[PDB]
Every structure is written in C-alpha cells, then in structure tokens.
C-alpha cells in the first residue's frame, strides 16, 4: 500500500 | 558523482548444449541510471531482449537485469555489451560456460 | 520469520525531452509485486506478483492515485533541488526515494523508512525514532527545518506504524504459498586448472529464496581463508537467486579446502 508523498522540499 | 557498473553475464538454469535456457546480464552499482545493455550472439546484437524494472538497493545503488530466451551451443559464443557515462567505449564480458 | 515492505522510486529529469521519468516499484522481501512507469502505456499501478491481482478495482484506483501524486512531489522536488544546489535547467538529475516498514515473525512493527537521495548522494532521511530528520548536507537543512516546524514526520509515522504494517500483513496472508516459502540453495562444485602447478575450484548456490546467503570457505579446517574471489548475489529471473565463491589452491591440496554454505532453507549448514 503506497504512501501519500504530498509534501515537497520547500513546503 | 559517477559510479562504474558491475557486470555479470550468466544463465537462469545450469548451462547445457542444445537445451533451452535464459541468458542474463546483471548490471548493478551504477550512477546515473541511463545504461545501454546489449546481449550478444557472435558479436551480433540480440534484438529481442527484455529488461527488469528500474530499482535500487538501500545504498541507492542501481540494479537491472536484461534477459533472453535461448538454446545454448558449442558453436555459438555469447557475451554482454555495456556502455555507460563512466565508460569511454563499450566493455564486453564473454559468457564463461562456468 | 521477519518480513519487509519497500517502495523504490526514481525520478530522472529529461531537459527539453518532456517531464522527468517516474519509475516506482514495490517489494515484499525480494518479490517485486507492483510497478509504476510514467513513460508506460498503462498510466496505472500494475501487478507483478499473482497474489496482488485478487485486489479489487478500488485498490488499483487508489494505488494509481497515490503514486501519480508522489510523481508530482518529486517533479516539484527536482526543480527545487536545482535552486538549493545552484544548478542549471540543461542538466539531467536523479531523485530516488525509498520508504517501507519491517515487521517481526508476529507481523508487528519493527522499523520504518522514509528517505531521499539526490544525484545518488543522500539528501534527507527519516530517523530510526520516526520523529526527526537526518539532513546530510547544507541544502537539505532548509527542508529539515520547515518539516520539523510543520511536524511532517507525524504524517509519515501514521503510515509506517499503521497502513504500511496493516497492508504488509494482508500481503503475507494472501500470498502465503510463495511469500512464506524458503527455497534451499541447490549446491554445486566445479574445478579448473590455473597454470598446471596451480588450480581453481568454485562452489555454487543456485535455486534459493531469499537473497540472504553466506558462501564462506575454510582451509585445513581453519576459518582463515580470506583471499577468496566472491561475487554479488544475482537473480536467476525465475524469482530465485544465485551466488558463487572461487578459491585458488596449491595443486594437490584441492581436497584439503572445505566450503560452508549458510541459508535458512537448510536447518544445518552445508559443508563441501
């Protein structure tokens, strides 16, 4: 089950 | 930074003259990912070569396995032709029967 | 025994040749079970193991969704990385990501991973504790500080201690037959001459699963035989792995040198 990777390096 | 590929040419099953097998070329430890892997049947490229999905190990070390369905002989000479950025000119490793 | 889930994803920019290529792969121990490729026809999360097809359209709908989002965050992250490392648009860069969890025999949480490497070198990694970050260089420090302020590790903690373990357990049941298995190594031994007054002999392990193997040798019953030629564990292609270790011996002492094979498919190790 894949993870929600929704936050970038600058956020 | 760049890392030169580790090449390993071998068979899926224990090799035997006239009996069906799969010739493998396992390239690992390379960076960047962009690689050219050709499987050879008497210096001439095997056009029907399939490959593994781009994956890596915990140490970010890239690995791929290019493979082909074949029948080995005593007459034909098999090998792996590989070119990367770390390599000026294609580095070929002959398939040693053993 | 112990088990693990891992998702390995690579993003390579192609300046002027479109949008960076995104290839995401999932594993249960050493079994590629899922696939995602941006350049591929499908444009959906695809199966790579038979036991994952039993998941309904809902699974594949959601899984395709999450992975296309991760694809965008790393697209976003590659442009950001150029800013932080003071780099040009004209260059092609790699952004790799690895995340998963380890579980014991009881299928209970043991470890969690959430990490990035830009251009093959570490960038930021989630700490063993699952609360803080490891910012490798100066640039990642800017990411660590914003993520610590915003308490981002919590969004990751909930996945790794929760959904990751809950999901891996479910995979271990549905794929009991192939995943819980332990294929023992099919032992082999060859002998070839070096240059008449010298000779080489190698042993092989060939039909095993998992990739965990120890091809250590012994001279005259002594563990001391470190000048060995050992190769990297390589995949056969039929979901099994192989490894060999060749040792050079003085011609006439070929019988004097023993080889010890360590694997879990064998209750007691094999000596040759």
Residue numbers in the entry:
A (entry chain C): 1 to 11
B (entry chain B): 1 to 98
C (entry chain A): 1 to 272
From the paper:
HLA-A*24:02 allele, highly prevalent in Indigenous populations, is associated with influenza-induced mortality, although the basis for this association is unclear. Here, we define CD8+ T-cell immune landscapes against IAV and IBV, restricted by the mortality-associated HLA-A24 allomorph. We identify immunodominant protective CD8+ T-cell epitopes, one towards IAV and six towards IBV, with A24/PB2550–558-specific CD8+ T cells being cross-reactive between IAV and IBV. Consistent with the HLA-A24 peptide-binding motif generated by NetMHC4.037,38 motif viewer, enrichment of Tyr/Phe at P2 and Phe/Leu/Ile at P9 were observed.
As we observed T-cell cross-reactivity between the A/PB2549–557 and B/PB2550–558 as well as T-cell reactivity in transgenic mice for the overlapping peptide A/PB2549–559, we next determined the impact of those variations within the PB2-derived peptides. We solved the structures of A/PB2549–557, the overlapping A/PB2549–559, and B/PB2550–558 peptides in complex with the HLA-A24 molecules at a resolution of 2.90, 2.95, and 2.16 Å, respectively with clear electron density for each peptide. Strikingly, the extra P10-Glu and P11-Thr residues of the 11mer extended outside the antigen-binding cleft, creating an unusual conformation that disturbed the interaction between the peptide and the HLA-A24 Lys146 at the C-terminal of the cleft. Thus, the bulged conformation of the extra residues in the A/PB2549–559 may represent a challenge for TCRs interacting with the C-terminal end of the peptide. However, only the A/PB2549–557 epitope showed immunogenicity in HLA-A24+ individuals, with the instability and bulged conformation of the longer A/PB2549–559 epitope potentially proving challenging for TCR recognition. Structural analysis of the overlapping peptides A/PB2549–557/559 and B/NP164/165–173 showed that despite the difference of only two or one amino acids in length respectively, these peptides each adopted different conformations with HLA-A24 and are likely to induce distinct TCR repertoires. Our data revealed that A24/IAV-specific CD8+ T-cell responses were immunodominant (>5% IFN-γ+ of CD8+ T-cells) towards 2 PB1- and 3 PB2-derived peptides: PB1216–224 (mean of 10.2% IFNγ+ of CD8+ cells in spleen, 16.5% in BAL), the published PB1498–505 (14.8% spleen, 23.3% BAL), PB2549–557 (10.1% spleen, 24.9% BAL), PB2549–559 (11.1% spleen, 24.4% BAL) and PB2463–471 (6% spleen, 9.3% BAL). Consistent with this preference for PB2 and PB1 peptides, the CD8+ T-cell response in IAV-infected HHD-A24 mice focused mostly on four epitopes from PB1 (PB1216–222 and PB1498–505; 36% primary splenic response) and PB2 (PB2549–557 and PB2549–559; 31% primary splenic response).
